[PDB]
Paper text:
S-Adenosylmethionine (SAMe) is the principal methyl donor of the cell and is synthesized via an ATP-driven process by methionine adenosyltransferase (MAT) enzymes. In humans, there are three genes, mat1A, mat2A and mat2B, which encode MAT enzymes. mat2A and mat2B transcribe MATα2 and MATβ enzyme subunits, respectively, with catalytic and regulatory roles. The MATα2β complex is expressed in nearly all tissues and is thought to be essential in providing the necessary SAMe flux for methylation of DNA and various proteins including histones. Here we report the crystallographic and solution X-ray scattering structures as well as biophysical analysis of the MATα2β complexes, providing the basis for fresh insight into this widely utilized system in biology.
Residue numbers in the entry:
A (entry chain B): 15 to 395
B (entry chain A): 15 to 115, 135 to 395
C (entry chain C): 66 to 114
D (entry chain F): 15 to 83, 85 to 92, 103 to 272, 276 to 323
Write the structure that this text describes.
Amino acid sequence: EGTFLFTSESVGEGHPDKICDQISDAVLDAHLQQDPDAKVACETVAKTGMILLAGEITSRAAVDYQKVVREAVKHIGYDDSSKGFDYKTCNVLVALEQQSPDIAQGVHLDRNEEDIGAGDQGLMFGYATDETEECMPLTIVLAHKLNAKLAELRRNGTLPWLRPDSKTQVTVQYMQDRGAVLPIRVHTIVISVQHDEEVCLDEMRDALKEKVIKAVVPAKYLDEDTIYHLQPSGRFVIGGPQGDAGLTGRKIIVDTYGGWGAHGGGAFSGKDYTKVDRSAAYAARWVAKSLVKGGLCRRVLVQVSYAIGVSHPLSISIFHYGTSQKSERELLEIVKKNFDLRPGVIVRDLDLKKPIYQRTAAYGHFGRDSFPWEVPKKLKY
Amino acid sequence: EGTFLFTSESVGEGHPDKICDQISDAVLDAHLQQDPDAKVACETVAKTGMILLAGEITSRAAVDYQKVVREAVKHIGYDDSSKGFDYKTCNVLVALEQQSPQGLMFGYATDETEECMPLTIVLAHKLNAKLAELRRNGTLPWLRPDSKTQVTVQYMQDRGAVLPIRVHTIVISVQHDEEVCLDEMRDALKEKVIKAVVPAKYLDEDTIYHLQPSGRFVIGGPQGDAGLTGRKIIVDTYGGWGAHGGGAFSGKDYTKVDRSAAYAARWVAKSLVKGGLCRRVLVQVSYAIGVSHPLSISIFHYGTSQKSERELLEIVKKNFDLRPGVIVRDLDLKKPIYQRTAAYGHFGRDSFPWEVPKKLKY
Amino acid sequence: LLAGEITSRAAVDYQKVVREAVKHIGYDDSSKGFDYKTCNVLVALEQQS
Amino acid sequence: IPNRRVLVTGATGLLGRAVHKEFQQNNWHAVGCGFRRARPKFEQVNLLDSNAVHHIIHDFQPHVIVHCAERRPDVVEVDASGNLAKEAAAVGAFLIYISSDYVFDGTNPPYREEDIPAPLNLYGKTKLDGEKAVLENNLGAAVLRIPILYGEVEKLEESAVTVMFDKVQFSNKSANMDHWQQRFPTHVKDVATVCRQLAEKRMLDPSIKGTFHWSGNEQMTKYEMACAIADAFNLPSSHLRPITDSPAQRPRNAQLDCSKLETLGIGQRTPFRIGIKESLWPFLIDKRWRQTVFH
Ligand SMILES: Nc1ncnc2c1ncn2[C@@H]1O[C@H](CO)[C@@H](O)[C@H]1O
């Protein structure tokens, strides 16, 4: 047949590499409140006792970094030596400078806003698939919503023995179909998630399966052979930044398409609208969703690239996996007519100065209701 | 038509995110060179005057991190306060938690270059390495370590494979001194660098040049931006081409499938194409929990093979042992080599094992 | 945080030293402000032989 | 959120994917089933498993049912067909047993809702056996008959009209094409609608049955279809031999007669220009070369 397997993963708010992605976006949000024109590249580190901030910021705003970090760590749910970590008593080192003068003069100074140049150079992709309502790959959609379900149940209390670190791998048996891909059945699910001392191992799997999995996954994709590795580590209560090493932007395939389509390198969190690693990556997603929802293809991947201090993209590229009647140039030409993909227009079109980034820090940036880039444009061809 | 664009990027040795990647594998080299069964997840954060080492280690080794850190920075070429950084003064904090005793990997290869790599990233790497070379001759003595490059190729689709027709746009930004004037640099980047690196057939008079489009690049290195280990994984792998589950390579030891199985996946895919069976291929190995052997393997040959996937797969099963334990043995993954990988990409390089095709009996 | 120059043959588990001392002093839970189990330990010693 | 119910057998196959979806875009609670490729889109139910069949008819409570139950050629050479009518009639479900024109001789056009059946082959015959079986186990059932079906296919072999497309594309190969035997292409999307309206009209008349005929108004042969198909994508047409030989089993025409069924405002006919052009664009060479999991 054309039957392949495929796996994508997500992680919980309280996984180190996602604590940083989220703290960084907190500091971003912070600055944007008092100053929407703040420039922010805040990379964050989480070691056993430590959250260290590092990066560069230009922002009129003054921010209490101690508070923003600790408030977000608290929101994440780490508050005792019982758990790995505790906002009340943790080390917070700051190493934030003013920003490089050589970027300022040749990126954002003395320029009519629609013609500000790229913050950096680089390449960004953006992808879409008719395989789900949200135009995202089932694998990565299910994967995220498991860690979402987990956290929701942690917070509202029905599963109080839950603790914020988690990981979820979701393997699906797919089938080709005139270029598009058709999910058939969930082949394997894995869930390790940090737990309390009290609750025993066999109530936890019983729980994961009926409270979490069954809620999230439509029974159509499950059958008898569907395999479940729920808490296959066992002794996962010692969990979080303790023992470990977090960094912002070490979960970029989780942050996006769970390994589908493509990715051009750029990390999202801790960066503002001038960093095209983020802005043009939300835009390219906007494009590829708008094309699919507008019925032009069932499946599409889009690439753009920028050069530092240059407003227009250096190259747009459309691959439609043979799923459109229109050729690939025909879609590309439609995209020229309907999108201005300079970083100064994208900020308007998607409102990228509002302090909303801490939502995007976990459970993925793409395929979610509220986000500006997820609202397809009515296209005029 | 059936003509398209595609772009890829690389960075020079001096880039803060890549500085970090070198130091993490420098630290790995250093440990294995004593205990060759060392277990290592070494992060490195680099920022103005700081190198921070973080994350679990288990080893029998005694490593003078000061020596390791500084010897890498010295090598990379940051030796005076004027460049923004100096291995003689830089602060070296260390937060490693030593002791003393699942998913999916992708490989890719293409017929479009001698090294079986998407042309876009090949040229991007060569430009950064060329710069570094010229810096280290003192042919271009006004060079500095941090740089960046991006190459947009104009391809043609052809029967599942891709045909590079021309270079369409090249971007180079490199850190320089405050003496040399702007024209001298852009005139040097074109002739002594780009024209030395790129086949003259792919260059013509429409090829768009962005040489120091930043305008002025004196402040850089860990100064100009924060740097972190494993933040350039698409530069480290296939430049946007192929696929990527999401493994950061550097600072991890051979016991990390993310790194070892990735290397083998490349080894395979390259062998297949070098072996005359495919023009292009992606190889997708999915390890599951409780299996020495890869549970599944899919081979996407973009229809460039006279053989079926099943046919192609079988060849692999009877040529390759992809049990993690065997991979480390077959590819000699206990040598203090890894620092050499952490710059100009892990794939497409001849010194490396996983880049030497296994000749295929089938 | 540890700072400053040493010259020695001994190899020393600074993690161990710093934590077993902080325990003996009696900082055992984050209820108290400090904990030998959860605290960061940075080392910045400049050691030769 | 809809009330009255439809079950579609062979809803994994070409005819049934249209039948099921055509009900379920005009407010019906629609549930197709199939033996193969059922999950996730349809229920898993083997027709020759007599227990499982009633198990789903019981549970769901279908007011109207539509049997279709392949890889077309064949076009050269059952019985739970009717066992379904037994079970379907019990629960008060109007069964529509889709059948082939191949039940006939093929000597005078047309053939009527009434005419004498005389099958010349394996296939033709056992489609008759199914009509008896269906109808005598329950004389409250329509035997809606159809000609050759093209439709919007997933693999070419799903239709005897579509299998030809490879032949039509490659000029470098020459192949022959059957002109001896007359043919009658019909969209499954149209049969989907005739099946839908012959059900919404089982209330506006509470007793309809006793055989029904439906076809498309576009007379062609394998060859004449092929050249339309070239002319839809604008391809070279002249690598294609006609024939009037018999490379001896098939009918040489049948043609259906849709008097009764047209009468009640029950019909739809998508032109073959478009019908087929919309079906076969994904199997253009250039689109096939472009259809891979990764770019
Ligand atoms: N003035 C500049 N022009 C172009 N690139 C730069 C400049 N300053 C820093 N960079 C590069 O871009 C990244 C952050 O913008 C840094 O890691 C560095 O490699």
